[PDB]
UniProtKB/Swiss-Prot annotation, chain A:
This is 3C-like proteinase nsp5. Cleaves the C-terminus of replicase polyprotein at 11 sites. Recognizes substrates containing the core sequence [ILMVF]-Q-|-[SGACN]. May cleave human NLRP1 in lung epithelial cells, thereby activating the NLRP1 inflammasome pathway. Also able to bind an ADP-ribose-1''-phosphate (ADRP). May cleave host ATP6V1G1 thereby modifying host vacuoles intracellular pH. Residues 1-302 form the Peptidase C30 domain. It is found in: Host cytoplasm; Host Golgi apparatus. It catalyses: TSAVLQ-|-SGFRK-NH2 and SGVTFQ-|-GKFKK the two peptides corresponding to the two self-cleavage sites of the SARS 3C-like proteinase are the two most reactive peptide substrates. The enzyme exhibits a strong preference for substrates containing Gln at P1 position and Leu at P2 position. The active site is at 41 (for 3cl-pro activity), 145 (for 3cl-pro activity). It comes from Severe acute respiratory syndrome coronavirus. Residues 1-302 are cytoplasmic.
């Protein structure tokens, strides 16, 4: 019983974190086998970040311009290259703590754990969702760039995020481990802003299922809805349009609880229309949208 | 920017988790140096632990660390824990301490099943000596901890779920938090309160982060604050708590009793549609130490 915003254990990713310094800029890197990955903006001067040309700035560097350290120990760089918005630094030794891993690009509305680091050392782990607008509502101070987001399946780490930038609203933007940004963001100082965001409807439904599994049914009702009629209501409350694919994803939780997907959508419609009337669900006074169906199934009893 | 509940990085603890099996019961154990600690109920209405343990041989305990079976060479009971001696000292043993935490204090929990870590979350010891954990069957022996620099201070080992679905367990000496016992009884969580000390810490966090609309021009006496806050089911604030908030009060230049006046007004008037650190609610699971640690960017 209970239901907590739970992160994946961070040990497999802790053993991959290093520090990368170029000039007077330090941030975090990820050391897998003989390669260190970090944000390419590490090469940028006080100025350069206004209109950087990364090809022109990089060709001006050698291997020995980069100081990579694991703890207090320097790792010599024997090669480098840029891949989109990441630098890939080859070092002269391998990381024996490299876990089994994949690089994956996640979809908006999916969750992952972030290991926040400063100067190559971990400070904390937390769980978040990639917003529909491709930002994350993170907790990051100056020096956190290069910190990574990941999920773990058995003993395989799927890295999905590397932190690059804070936007004017104090939300966060970053890239996958191929260096491609999530969202329309760029690694320079511009006027760029987070786009419109929506509530992740599929996650809110999953979480209402969590609440039923855990014993609570106060918010249920005698009604059903069509998908169309549900969307006609939810979209007025800034919720992401619900599709049949999303309905099908909720099948397992529906079967576990005996509550048809559309009947749970009818409960959600009523909660949106009437509010929560001072009541809580899974201890919350608000509808939570940062747990996916898979997160609920992983955490709750069968 | 951002304020998130964050757990400590869990790697130093992950390297200590093992599975302990007695007959048909499997739970988790904590392997430090050549000792594995686990709940004594692994050997189980009215248990006679001392008498039950008599019937147990070293060979009865199957201890597995990843794929490696650890040979048990001694066993004894210490309060509500078993201490199993094994023939291998854990190569991953971190610097560590065992500590008994106080109500209201926080720690990270690494939820484990079959000796395999599954997730990590932050939680508080409630004033009623329970924790609002997330635990399924097989969780027992999962541990709570804090870290200072390189040193893991273990503070909780999980033993039981109570009828409201909250959780009870022991320190790493095997003594229960609260009046709970490791038997089937009618035991229940008592009434709980909101951890005032932590709500104040979190309001200081909000101010440090530039969210300060709730501050005002007034102050309160402690007694007047307690008269109001106790009506809202808040824990009574003591002079000792006022002093624990000294470093946050100094950093912000906002006297604790002036923050209390701000907190009184929020309890009496509500938030009026506004948010504090993005929350519509007053958060009570961040201690004064959690706030300094997060706002000062400390690493381990």
């Amino acid at each position: 019983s209970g239901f907590r915003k739970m992160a994946f254990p961070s040990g497999k990713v802790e053993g991959c974190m290093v520090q990368v310094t170029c000039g007077t800029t330090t941030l975090n890197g990820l050391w897998l086998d003989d390669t260190v990955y970090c944000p390419r903006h590490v090469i940028c001067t006080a100025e350069d970040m206004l209109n950087p040309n990364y090809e022109d700035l990089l060709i001006r560097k050698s291997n020995h311009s980069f100081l990579v350290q694991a703890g207090n120990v320097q790792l010599r760089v024997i090669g480098h290259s840029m891949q989109n918005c990441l630098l890939r630094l080859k070092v002269d030794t391998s990381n024996p703590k490299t876990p089994k891993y994949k690089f994956v690009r996640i979809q908006p509305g999916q969750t992952f754990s972030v290991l926040a680091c400063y100067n190559g050392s971990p400070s904390g782990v937390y769980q978040c969702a990639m917003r529909p607008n491709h930002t994350i509502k993170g907790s990051f101070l100056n020096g956190s760039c290069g910190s990574v987001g990941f999920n773990i399946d058995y003993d395989c780490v799927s890295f999905c995020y590397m932190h690059h930038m804070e936007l004017p609203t104090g939300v966060h933007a970053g890239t996958d481990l191929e260096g491609k940004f999530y969202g329309p963001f760029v690694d320079r100082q511009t006027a760029q802003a987070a786009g419109t965001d929506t509530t992740i409807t599929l996650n809110v439904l999953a979480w209402l299922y969590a609440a039923v599994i855990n014993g609570d049914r106060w918010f249920l009702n005698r009604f059903t809805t069509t998908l169309n009629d549900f969307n006609l209501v939810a979209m007025k409350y800034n919720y992401e349009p619900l599709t049949q694919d999303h309905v099908d994803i909720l099948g397992p939780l529906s079967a576990q609880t005996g509550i048809a997907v559309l009947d749970m959508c009818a409960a959600l419609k009523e909660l949106l229309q009437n509010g929560m009337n001072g009541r809580t669900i899974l201890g919350s006074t608000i509808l939570e949208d940062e747990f996916t169906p898979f997160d609920v199934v992983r955490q709750c009893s069968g």
